[PDB]
Amino acid sequence: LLIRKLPFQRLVREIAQDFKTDLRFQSSAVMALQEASEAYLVGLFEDTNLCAIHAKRVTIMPKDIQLARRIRGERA
Amino acid sequence: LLIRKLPFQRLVREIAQDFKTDLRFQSSAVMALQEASEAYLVGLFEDTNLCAIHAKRVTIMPKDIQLARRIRGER
Amino acid sequence: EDEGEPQEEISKHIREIFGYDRKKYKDESDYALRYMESSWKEQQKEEAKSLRLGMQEDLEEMRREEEEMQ
Amino acid sequence: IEDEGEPQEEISKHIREIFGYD
Amino acid sequence: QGITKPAIRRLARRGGVKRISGLIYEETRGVLKVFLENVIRDAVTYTEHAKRKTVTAMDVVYALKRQGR
Amino acid sequence: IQGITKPAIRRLARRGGVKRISGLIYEETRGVLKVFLENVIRDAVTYTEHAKRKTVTAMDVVYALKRQ
């Protein structure tokens, strides 16, 4: 993995608390969560970057991300 | 509606026979495929054109289609 | 109290899958018939600009980088 | 038959696969 | 060939495109071929694995449940 | 909160193939990363409430993933 372990656990925890108030997570279940989030974000960036490329650019802009999301189906 | 019904069916029949030997398909079933295929390509061009303009361009090209697909996942 | 009307509901669903719509279908001018393809000079002028712009975009950002660094 | 293999105990390899990842 | 050239224009302008290159026409056909390949293949499997005689709308409609877009 | 450190991001982006990054990608990536979790756990929970189970196993995530 590539995200730091501790600061990821805390985030999952805040959201998890939010829905539902009674809430408990397994140890590997959070591990599985992290490994997904990275895979996804790398998945995402490869797309994002190739919209940077499409624009004949090198630096990626949010506009690139946003496109890559509109085209898949991600809201917002 | 917007493709002529005839040559489309010709295209449909063919692709079934191109693998499934003499599988039959109903009428109202192809009127569903076309209605889908139309509606899709439209959907697709919506996106094709987004990349067109993403690139600071106007006239859409294969690069635009293809990218649009590559992002959606398709071959 | 509760009711509808038409009888071709297996199609108006397919269209709903992809988001297709009835609305822009009465203004069908021939633009599409004839003014819709681009001269190969025109395409090549478009990339020319697409290109120029991309680079400028890229650089202004690097400059921004300097400002942000300090 | 020697035609069944052997493991490593990692399930994550499936998630890597859900999104496509080295 | 696979589809009416001018049709794919009208299909595009519905997409909202105002300009295209000649290269599009072929590319579009290709993209449809494979669309069709994919869905009819999956429509068949719907009719077999329901032991049904041969294909119908709802095989298609079910086969289309593969699409956000 | 958003302890998703900027150089964490760069690691991933670069893993993606990215070669240069606008400064606003950070806030953006953060925003999406949240949303991804927000509704991948939202939908995992539901796979665990519907086994009337105490806590959420990895397995029910993998299930909540496949919907995505």
What does this entry look like structurally?
The complex is a heterohexamer, with two copies of chain A, two copies of chain C and two copies of chain E. Chain A is mostly helical and 76 residues long. Chain A has three helices and one strand. Chain E has 69 residues and is mainly alpha-helical. In chain E, 62% of the residues lie in helices and 0% in strands. Chain E is elongated. Chains in contact: A-B, A-C, A-D, A-F, B-C, B-E, C-E, C-F, D-F. At the A-F interface, helix 1, helix 2, strand 1 and helix 3 of A face helix 1, strand 1, helix 2 and helix 3 of F. Strand 1 of chain A pairs parallel with strand 1 of chain F, so a sheet runs across the interface.
Summed up, the helix count of chain C is 3
| Biggest sheet record of chain A | none
The secondary-structure class of chain A comes to mainly alpha
End-to-end separation of chain A in angstroms reads 27 Å
Tally of discrete structural domains of chain A: 1
Topology pattern of chain C, helix = H, strand = E: HHH
What can be said about the biggest beta sheet of chain C? none
Overall 3D geometry of chain A? elongated
| Quaternary state of the chains | heterohexamer
The percent of residues in helical segments of chain A reads 55-70%
Number of domains of chain C: 1
The top level CATH class name of chain A: Mainly Alpha
PDB class: transcription regulator
Keywords: chaperone, transcription, transcription regulator
Assembly: hexameric
Entry title: Structure of histone H3/H4 in complex with Spt2
